[PDB]
Design a binder for these strands. Sequence first.
RNA 1: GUCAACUGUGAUUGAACAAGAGUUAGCCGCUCCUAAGGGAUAGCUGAAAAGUGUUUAAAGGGGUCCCCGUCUCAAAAGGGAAACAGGUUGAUAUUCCUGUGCCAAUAGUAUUAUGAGUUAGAUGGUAACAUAUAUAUAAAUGAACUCCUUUACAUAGGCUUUACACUCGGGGUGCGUUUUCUUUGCACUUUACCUUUAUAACAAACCUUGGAAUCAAUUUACUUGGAGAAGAGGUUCGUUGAACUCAAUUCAAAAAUUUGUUUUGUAGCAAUAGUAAUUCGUAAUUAUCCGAAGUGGUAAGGACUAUCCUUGAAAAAAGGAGGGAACGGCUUUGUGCUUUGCUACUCUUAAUACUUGUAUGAGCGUACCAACAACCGCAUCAGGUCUCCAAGGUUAACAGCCUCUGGUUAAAUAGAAAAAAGUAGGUAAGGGAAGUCGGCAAAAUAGAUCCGUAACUUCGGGAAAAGGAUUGGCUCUGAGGACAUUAAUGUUAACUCAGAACUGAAACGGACAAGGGGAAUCCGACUGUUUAAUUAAAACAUAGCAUUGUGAAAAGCCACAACUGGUAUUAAC
Lengths: 106, 85, 43, 72, 60, 247
Amino acid sequence: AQRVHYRRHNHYNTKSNKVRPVRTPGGKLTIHVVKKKAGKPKCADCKTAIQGVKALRPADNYRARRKNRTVARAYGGSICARCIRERIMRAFLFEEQKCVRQVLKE
Amino acid sequence: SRRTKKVGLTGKYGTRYGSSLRKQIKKIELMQHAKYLCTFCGKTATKRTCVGIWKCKKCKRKVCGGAWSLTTPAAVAAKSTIIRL
Amino acid sequence: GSIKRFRLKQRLGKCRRQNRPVPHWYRLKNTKRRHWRRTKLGL
Amino acid sequence: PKQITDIRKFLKISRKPDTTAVIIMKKKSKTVITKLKLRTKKYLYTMVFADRKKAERIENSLLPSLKRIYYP
Amino acid sequence: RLYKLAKRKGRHMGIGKRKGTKNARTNQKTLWIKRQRVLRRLLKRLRDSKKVDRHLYHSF
Amino acid sequence: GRVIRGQRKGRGSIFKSHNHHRKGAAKLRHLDYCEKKGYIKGLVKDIIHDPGRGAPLAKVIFKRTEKYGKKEELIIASEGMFTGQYISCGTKAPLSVGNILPIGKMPEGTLICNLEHRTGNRGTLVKASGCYATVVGQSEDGKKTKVRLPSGAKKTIDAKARAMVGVVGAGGRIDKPILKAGVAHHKYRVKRNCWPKVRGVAMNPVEHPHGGGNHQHIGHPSTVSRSAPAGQKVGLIAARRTGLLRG
RNA sequence: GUCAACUGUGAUUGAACAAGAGUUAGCCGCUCCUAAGGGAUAGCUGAAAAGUGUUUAAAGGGGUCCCCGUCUCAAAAGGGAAACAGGUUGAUAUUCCUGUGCCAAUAGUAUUAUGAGUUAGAUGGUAACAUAUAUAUAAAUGAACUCCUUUACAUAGGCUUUACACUCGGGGUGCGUUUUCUUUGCACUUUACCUUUAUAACAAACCUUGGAAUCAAUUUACUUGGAGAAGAGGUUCGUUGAACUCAAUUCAAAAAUUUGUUUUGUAGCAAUAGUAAUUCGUAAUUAUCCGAAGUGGUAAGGACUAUCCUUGAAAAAAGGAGGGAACGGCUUUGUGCUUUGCUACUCUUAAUACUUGUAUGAGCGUACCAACAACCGCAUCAGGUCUCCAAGGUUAACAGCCUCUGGUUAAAUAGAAAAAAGUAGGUAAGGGAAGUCGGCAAAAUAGAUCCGUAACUUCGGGAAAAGGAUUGGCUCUGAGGACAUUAAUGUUAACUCAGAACUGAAACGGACAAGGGGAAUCCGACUGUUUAAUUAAAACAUAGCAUUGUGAAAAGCCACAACUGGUAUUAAC
């Protein structure tokens, strides 16, 4: 076949240096170092990835259009829909329950 | 079909080690991987994830527990004693 | 190695320069000489 | 490199100041077809013209001052 | 290519010609998985086409 | 000879604690007005493991008493407590599992942990897995309180020292035997270099007082005085008695 | 160039000698961040030298008088702004050249143009959530103060998806064998970054509806469900990176701009570039560059499951949200504020002009060897020395044997002769351990399928026990799938199994590969480890058992001259 070799001045097979064989239009089989796969961004309460938000690294998250980073809805790309829904309910329910309790108490 | 007359869970250790030693391990391991009933939901999904830490799969909630069980008898007696007052 | 620090590179050049034999017209008016293989620079 | 589809958008780029060059290329495939490439400093935009008559009229239509390259 | 055409025609799979354990010759696990997929595939078609009842499907 | 194996262990070189994955110290919420005069309720947000000890650690959030917003502490977890439990701390806190109360306000015969050996010290007795202390009495003029540490000694502390209602987590840990050497290797790997042990009598004389001879015999008494000097302290240190137990 | 010496033989050679020459980066690194840690500051000790690192700190920054807060070094394999293809030289190239991009800066002031909002903060969507396509997706008010998240992580096992690799068949080119046979054997048939790449596809997750026991759905694996399943319709991330009629176009049927049918384009990048050919000058042309599929060797991902008295770094840096501080422009009486008069204003990219020190990309590395002669071993020393790439046949096989790409055909010598002896090997009639301290050495065995398998046992094992049989080549037979037509009828894929003939000097795991076994005793439970260059063991370690001190900073145990430390980010399990 053909063989490949590192071109980027650090040849060890470390997690950030993983490498993908690719053929050139020169008919040469060459090597490319593919970027690191990145974690999904997670809800504050439940540590679970949130819809719409792209999983971009701290370099790529800076360059993308703003719409990719967040959700037009309450605590956006920082709390998920299920938790927010439950939280909104708590915020009403306890406030009523507290007022009732005070009225009862006197 | 029925693999072992005795050994069960501790069969992994094989011909090595004392039978008495192995028996003592067998009781604790049977207890260890046992699925506890989760009193935050009513499913039998509570498992041990690390030495003292018990997670329910359904509730995604961490109960603090014993080394080899969800509840040690010492704690149960203490809990009851508190409850009575 | 491939890489060097600048002081080290400059020094390696200095040694190389030092080797260069005595100029031929001067003899018409040597004893000390680095050779690479068996006589390491060490520095 | 970017691919244009709208003839009007192509014309719109064509009028503008930083659109330095028009790079035009015509070739066989099986019959003749035309690739029209425009060179803006920011990008090289390409439009694929499948009919000679349209291509001929548009190549004529352009502002003539704008630089012209043929590959051969 | 000639040898391979002959192997297709079944000519060198005899007991002496083999040189490895049966599981190494072909993996038992893969064979099972193949078979389970064939049986599941048939069942999904039978339920989708509505030519069995759900209850019968589940038992099968 | 040369420095003996016991002495080398102390000296602050390689035998320093295996720091690296430890999650930070476990010490109670420090004493303030808000606790002293009442109660403060906090949230357990998480229970997290620790490479050092059997007990899990409990991630506790309070809201600050003189500044906006939430501040996180690490408490050592009582058995039977849980994520999303409200944890209460203070003089008026109710007797209930995993709350933090002054020992002066315990009813007798309660089981507790996280004793402060002297007040305000953020908890320093009863922290290892499955331990507990028992409260055994309150003096007539109050002010002092009598408790029992799990070793078997009775001790008298100030009343306003903290403790935590309920037994320490991870009970029964040494019930399970360690079957194979590698498990023991892994146990010590996250603690301190102290293992495998090496029998002193098998050493050369130069390294240790039991060394030498031709049958690995101890060759002189195995009990050495409390008064013994540094390199001499060998086998059974200052022992009251030797041989099997009775009570 | 060249042969004084060296290149252990020769030598016109050469890693020798001589003369010149060569290393080009915003993107590849260093450079920045923190880790194990190091060195200092405050103290304090100490004659000093030094030993300590917040232990009596008026100490480094952020907001605009308040709030944070040791400094500094320590990764060329952790974290980490951004780059690829082709070509080119005697010697460099992700660095020069040509093309194409990408990333980061990009001051003030004034003009212009780009779109927003307004008569001080847009809309859609039931929802999950979606929305700016401007030469450019620029632009969707937001202070203090907060709260998160990404950065950012173990191991094992399988499953699955894509990529590359390999293979097969067909068309096209060239070449080869071509006595005989050979619709043949072989070669070539190329496609990058970049375009939030456009879409499709798929594992999940989530939503709307729906209301489930004769439980259901369901994976290789088990998982999941009234805390809402199946079903039906959706929304998103992640893989992927032109899949899919994708886009453009055409005609037919539509709405005051859609569905159906056709034509194009290797989706742009892209053929002008490569490669194989073919001619003519002696540079120029022409022709080619594409229809089906399989194997699963690599690598990445996905969804997962299991394992742990082990739970598997940190920050720099970036992002999101909570919160609601601040808020037209112009003219003007009066002390940024108040009342009068007027309406195109506030944002925001990009370009331009002018001033402001000279207003775009700093410095350093980049030759060559990397051992076979460039390293270390006193040297051109059969030694030692870190990482990635991984072709065909045979095969369990990245083994061993032979082969293609690529490399070499040289080793501190050659020829001729051929004896003892040596050394690395073969092989031996008949006997079969009689040799020897000692079956040491050597040999026998061995691959697989099918059978058969004891004492004893902690019931797990012993066990491949022991002990048998079979195995080639040929010619057949049976078994095992996938699709799509309206039960039958068709198209169509692999390799593995099982059975039967015939055939031969009874041979066939033919080479290579590859267990000697049994009956007992002694010691050591075991796996583990050790005397580097005389001892691998019965020594040592180990789990378990047993013992002892110690309740704490006036303690245990231990280090230090001293102050001070360590065990201790600890606490009787």
